[PDB]
């Protein structure tokens, strides 16, 4: 298969005042590259569009938001003097011609700007094994995975059964819950379910794993707290089937 729009990096945590540079590579054959900022509060806001190395159109952002395009159509954007309200999904879209051809979006760079890196925590992850009553009543077995206490919300949760990623029988919450809803820097929790037949759960050779990838601090971020540095990492929990 051919590449879609690509964006690098995927996830960023920064402190106030810092700067970031983001990159986007358009689909091969697309020369128009556009940037958008998506926030819960303002929705989806145009930054600027490039074609053949020059800015063709611009939105209403202040000058600390800047962009550029290279001869191979790759585009960068930069945000200087970062502020808490700059936390957003920064989306790239490519098009053959934005005037008359569809926009094709990347999956974005997720940026969180925080007051202090001591606010950053990886998830704790646990799997809870099925109810005996569910198994007797329905001949089905639901496992729950909880990922709790994380900040920022830069997580990807997945289920693996005997080493294979599964989507059948899974449902993961679309958004996390705030553990302390009143606070701007509240930590988050996320739940997911995996449901299998009772017969499948009852085989002790079947192995279940809930994986949470957490995207955290860089090796270049200073860390002087006693607790472990909250670097990018996977936190996982597992179970095996049980005959009784």
């Amino acid at each position: 298969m051919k590449a879609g729009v690509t964006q690098t990096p995927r996830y960023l945590i920064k402190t106030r005042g810092q700067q970031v540079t983001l990159s986007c590579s358009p689909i091969s054959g697309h020369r128009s590259v556009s940037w958008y900022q998506q926030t819960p509060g303002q929705g989806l806001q145009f930054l600027f569009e490039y074609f053949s190395e020059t800015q063709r159109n611009k939105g209403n952002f202040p000058g600390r938001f800047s962009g550029r395009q290279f001869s191979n159509s790759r585009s960068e954007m930069n945000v200087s003097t970062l502020e808490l309200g700059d936390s957003a999904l920064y989306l790239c879209a490519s098009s053959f011609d934005s005037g008359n051809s569809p926009l094709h979006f990347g999956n974005g760079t997720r940026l969180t700007v925080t007051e202090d890196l001591n606010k950053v925590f990886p998830p704790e992850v646990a799997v809870f094994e099925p109810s005996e009553a569910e198994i007797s009543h329905t001949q089905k077995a639901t496992l729950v995975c909880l990922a709790t206490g994380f900040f920022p919300d830069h997580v990807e949760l997945s289920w693996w059964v005997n080493g294979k990623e599964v989507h059948s029988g899974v449902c993961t919450d679309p958004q996390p819950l705030k553990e302390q809803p009143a606070l701007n820097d509240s930590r988050y929790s996320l739940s997911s379910r995996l449901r299998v037949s009772a017969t499948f759960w009852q085989n002790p050779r079947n192995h279940f794993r809930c994986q949470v990838q957490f995207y955290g601090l860089s090796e270049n971020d200073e860390w002087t707290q006693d607790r472990a540095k909250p670097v990018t990492q996977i936190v996982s929990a597992e179970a095996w089937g049980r005959a009784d």
Binding site: L103, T142, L146, R193
Partner: protein
């Protein structure tokens, strides 16, 4: 003039199989194209339709959108809705030198639960967790799950799983806490749940 793109409804919940209607309006009729997109949680946007300023409609599969440029309106019609249509739907217009997105319609297409079997189960504790966990499951799609009265009881919203190879879908919500005065019997007490809900003895 200042372009303003408005989308209604902000949110739409409907049973699968129903047709649905999504509305977009734009105050400045001097547009070059109108586009409709969908966006899933944790992803970018997918282009569904592009209607040129000279066109009155576009169709793709179950989707049909009209454009009335002089009236400042587009309607997106989705026939025979499916659970996989659930997404945020965004309207955008291309102006001479600007681009504008509406605020979106968040669409949830609910599964028809053929044999509801509402129940609240307790899952086994984890030797690596200190939480007690409860699962409300197998209820019909008309059931609404509410948040707890208690600030240290956490309740998720209903989530639909599909056991593909058994052609079986089910709703569930999870509740958990690490307080000690907590019981799965009472975890969902702030929700209106079916009177026939099964509460197994513990």
């Amino acid at each position: 003039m200042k372009q303003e793109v408005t989308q209604i409804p902000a949110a739409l919940s409907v049973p699968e199989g129903e047709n649905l209607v999504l509305n977009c309006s734009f105050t400045d009729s001097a547009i070059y194209n109108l586009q409709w997109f969908r966006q899933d949680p944790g992803k970018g946007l997918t282009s569904l339709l592009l209607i040129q300023s000279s066109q009155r409609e576009q169709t793709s599969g179950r989707l049909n959108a009209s454009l009335d440029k002089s009236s400042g309106r587009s309607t997106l019609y989705i026939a025979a809705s499916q659970p996989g249509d659930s997404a945020t739907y965004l309207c955008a217009v291309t102006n001479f030198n600007k681009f504008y997105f509406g605020s979106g319609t968040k669409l949830n297409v609910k599964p028809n639960i053929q044999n509801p079997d509402p129940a609240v189960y307790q899952l086994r504790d984890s030797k690596s967790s200190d939480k007690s966990v409860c699962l409300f499951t197998d209820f019909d799609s008309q059931t609404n799950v509410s948040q707890s009265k208690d600030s240290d009881v956490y309740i998720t919203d209903k989530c639909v799983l599909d056991m593909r190879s058994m052609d079986f879908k089910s709703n569930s919500a999870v509740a958990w806490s690490n307080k000690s005065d907590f019981a799965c019997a009472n975890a969902f007490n702030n929700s209106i749940i079916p009177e026939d809900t099964f509460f197994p003895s513990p």
